[PDB]
Design an enzyme around this catalytic site. Structure first.
Site, PDB file in Angstrom:
ATOM      1  N   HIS A   1      -3.219  10.773   0.509  1.00 27.48           N
ATOM      2  CA  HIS A   1      -2.820  10.535   1.784  1.00 27.48           C
ATOM      3  C   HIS A   1      -2.111  11.994   2.236  1.00 27.48           C
ATOM      4  CE1 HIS A   1      -1.338   7.007   4.495  1.00 27.48           C
ATOM      5  NE2 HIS A   1      -1.049   8.329   5.340  1.00 27.48           N
TER       6      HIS A   1
ATOM      7  N   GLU B   1      -3.678  -0.360   8.164  1.00 25.30           N
ATOM      8  CA  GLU B   1      -2.726  -0.039   8.860  1.00 25.30           C
ATOM      9  C   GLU B   1      -2.725  -0.482  10.308  1.00 25.30           C
ATOM     10  OE1 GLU B   1      -1.938   4.141   9.007  1.00 25.30           O
ATOM     11  OE2 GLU B   1      -2.376   4.821   6.940  1.00 25.30           O
TER      12      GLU B   1
ATOM     13  N   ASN C   1      -7.948   1.412   9.876  1.00 25.85           N
ATOM     14  CA  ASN C   1      -6.749   1.466  10.370  1.00 25.85           C
ATOM     15  C   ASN C   1      -7.006   1.354  11.721  1.00 25.85           C
ATOM     16  OD1 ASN C   1      -5.663   2.184   7.932  1.00 25.85           O
ATOM     17  ND2 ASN C   1      -5.129   4.202   8.405  1.00 25.85           N
TER      18      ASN C   1
ATOM     19  N   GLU D   1      -7.949   8.379   6.019  1.00 29.89           N
ATOM     20  CA  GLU D   1      -8.245   8.783   7.278  1.00 29.89           C
ATOM     21  C   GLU D   1      -8.951  10.473   7.061  1.00 29.89           C
ATOM     22  OE1 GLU D   1      -4.871   8.874  10.166  1.00 29.89           O
ATOM     23  OE2 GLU D   1      -4.949   6.436   9.901  1.00 29.89           O
TER      24      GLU D   1
ATOM     25  N   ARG E   1       0.644  -1.358  -0.076  1.00 32.74           N
ATOM     26  CA  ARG E   1      -0.089  -0.007   0.174  1.00 32.74           C
ATOM     27  C   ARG E   1       1.080   1.089  -0.138  1.00 32.74           C
ATOM     28  NH1 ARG E   1      -3.405   2.900   4.522  1.00 32.74           N
ATOM     29  NH2 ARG E   1      -4.131   4.545   3.384  1.00 32.74           N
TER      30      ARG E   1
HETATM   31  O1  LIG Z   1      -2.162   7.104   7.967  1.00 29.25           O
HETATM   32  C1  LIG Z   1      -1.254   6.957   8.871  1.00 29.25           C
HETATM   33  N1  LIG Z   1      -1.951   6.812  10.059  1.00 29.25           N
HETATM   34  C2  LIG Z   1      -1.422   6.920  11.646  1.00 29.25           C
HETATM   35  C3  LIG Z   1       0.082   6.641  11.272  1.00 29.25           C
HETATM   36  C4  LIG Z   1       0.806   6.741  12.602  1.00 29.25           C
HETATM   37  O2  LIG Z   1       0.598   8.082  13.350  1.00 29.25           O
HETATM   38  C5  LIG Z   1       0.722   7.584  10.338  1.00 29.25           C
HETATM   39  O3  LIG Z   1       2.028   7.699   9.895  1.00 29.25           O
HETATM   40  C6  LIG Z   1      -0.048   7.173   8.842  1.00 29.25           C
HETATM   41  O4  LIG Z   1       0.319   8.297   7.879  1.00 29.25           O
END
Ligand SMILES: O=C1NC[C@H](CO)[C@@H](O)[C@@H]1O
Length: 439
Positions: free
Chosen positions: A119, A345, A290, A164, A75
């Site tokens: 992102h 994630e 995530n 996110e 990813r």
């Molecule tokens: O997508 C994400 N979520 C949280 C990770 C750790 O804080 C961050 O590094 C990443 O960009």
């Protein structure tokens, strides 16, 4: 022994601005993370993404590492301003070239590409026009997505519109801790809404241009628990609906925001926001969750604050609560029943050090990962359609407003040499992948 389904997808995940460096190379436009991190005070130690992991030059060695580890999926995200330097209009062929080489190398190596369209590195040119606050970003985002689909959709078949979107909206536009660094609750909730509209326009464009691929969307999630059996239980219900997948999945699946979100935030949303909900329900193929941490919560006159607990914590200070990942997987099936789920994630920051033996003995990271993978296995046994799991991250990288001070990789990066050192956790994850599971 905990074995996963045949063909289950084990991966690692990164993001463009966190690893690439060279943000203005080969005709790229500035992003909001470039201008934000170049503003004094915004990022720890004045760190920026100017160099990062130098993946912009070292991409082949990093992929050769993914291969050598036996990891089956990667990813990664595309920098919007590398592809369209002013956000819309002109397409930069050298930006396309950079990702085309990565995509082709992965396919040659038999690694499945999972592409994140957005992102967090919005083109600066579009931020000047209001960025996620402007309704027109639905059009800009659709034009951008169409370029990616037309150029790469012959080879990439698995796509993610947004990473996110709660963080993009709230941390970027309410807390002001992330780019573009604003503090305005009305802007923040307009960004929520526009992120949904842009996501849905991109899916609509996907259906016309990549007739054989799949597309989804990724949410951050916390496991919230109440500080008393008392207002306290509702505060927890609020945090799940606001901070977790429901803020976006209720619109997508049910055509309105969740109940407690509307109670808190109705005044901050556009007046006729419901007019857009028909379009927002555009059908998605999968949900990416995530997951990192658990949180004890109580009412506190967002009428909510966290209570610290004497639990093991990571270098981020995030309490380690592995049963949270089981909880969020069960809950998403129970609430929206998506046809497929991925954990997109899961990972941990620990204060890694290269031992005198040349190795990185991160048993703490191994322990963290093992426990969360065990909990994911449980969800599968109980009927959650989990198709894959992605470790955050392949590499130590630029951890946003924490800079380089926080290391999430299963591969160590010495930033003075750019040398990569596979950590114990990477070796351990590689064995998990090969065995298709734990033991
Ligand atoms: O997508 C994400 N979520 C949280 C990770 C750790 O804080 C961050 O590094 C990443 O960009």
């Amino acid at each position: 022994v905990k074995k996963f389904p045949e063909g289950f997808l084990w991966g690692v995940a990164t993001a463009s601005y966190q690893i690439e460096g060279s943000p203005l190379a080969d005709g790229a436009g500035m992003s909001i993370w470039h201008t934000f991190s170049h503003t004094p005070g915004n990022v720890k130690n004045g760190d920026t993404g100017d160099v990062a992991c130098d993946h912009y030059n070292r991409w082949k060695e990093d992929i050769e590492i993914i291969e050598k580890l036996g990891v089956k999926a990667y990813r990664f995200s595309i920098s919007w301003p590398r592809i369209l330097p002013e956000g819309t209009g002109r397409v930069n062929q050298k930006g396309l070239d950079f990702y085309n080489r990565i995509i082709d190398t992965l396919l040659e190596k038999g690694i499945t590409p999972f592409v994140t369209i957005y992102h967090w590195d919005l083109p600066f040119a579009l931020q000047l026009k209001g960025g996620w606050a402007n309704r027109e970003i639905a059009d800009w985002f659709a034009e951008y997505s169409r370029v990616l689909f037309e150029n790469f959709g012959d080879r990439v078949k698995n796509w993610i519109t947004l990473n996110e979107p709660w963080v993009v909206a709230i941390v970027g536009h309410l807390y002001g801790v992330h780019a573009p660094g604003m503090r305005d609750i009305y802007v923040a909730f307009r960004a929520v809404h526009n992120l949904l509209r842009a996501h849905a326009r991109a899916v609509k464009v996907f259906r016309e241009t990549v007739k054989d691929g799949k597309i989804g969307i990724v949410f951050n999630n916390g496991y919230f628990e109440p500080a008393s059996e008392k207002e306290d239980i509702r505060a927890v219900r609020f945090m799940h609906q606001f901070n977790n997948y429901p803020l976006f999945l209720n619109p997508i699946y049910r055509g309105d925001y969740p109940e407690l979100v509307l109670e808190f935030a109705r005044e901050y949303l556009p007046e006729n926001y419901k007019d857009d909900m028909s379009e927002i329900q555009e059908k998605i193929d999968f949900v990416g969750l995530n997951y990192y941490s658990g949180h004890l919560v109580k009412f506190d006159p967002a009428k909510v604050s966290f209570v610290e607990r004497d639990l093991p914590k990571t270098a981020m200070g995030w309490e380690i609560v592995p049963e949270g990942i089981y909880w969020i997987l069960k809950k998403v099936k129970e609430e929206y029943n998506p046809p497929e789920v991925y954990i997109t994630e899961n990972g941990a920051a620990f204060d890694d050090v290269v031992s005198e033996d040349g190795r990185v003995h991160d048993q703490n990271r191994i322990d963290y990962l093992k426990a969360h993978i065990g909990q994911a296995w449980k969800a599968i046994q109980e009927g959650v359609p989990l198709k894959g799991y992605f470790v955050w991250s392949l590499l130590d990288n630029f951890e946003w407003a924490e800079g380089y001070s926080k290391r999430f990789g299963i591969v160590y990066v010495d930033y003075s040499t750019q040398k990569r050192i596979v950590k114990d956790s990477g070796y351990w994850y590689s064995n998990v992948v090969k065995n298709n599971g734990l033991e």
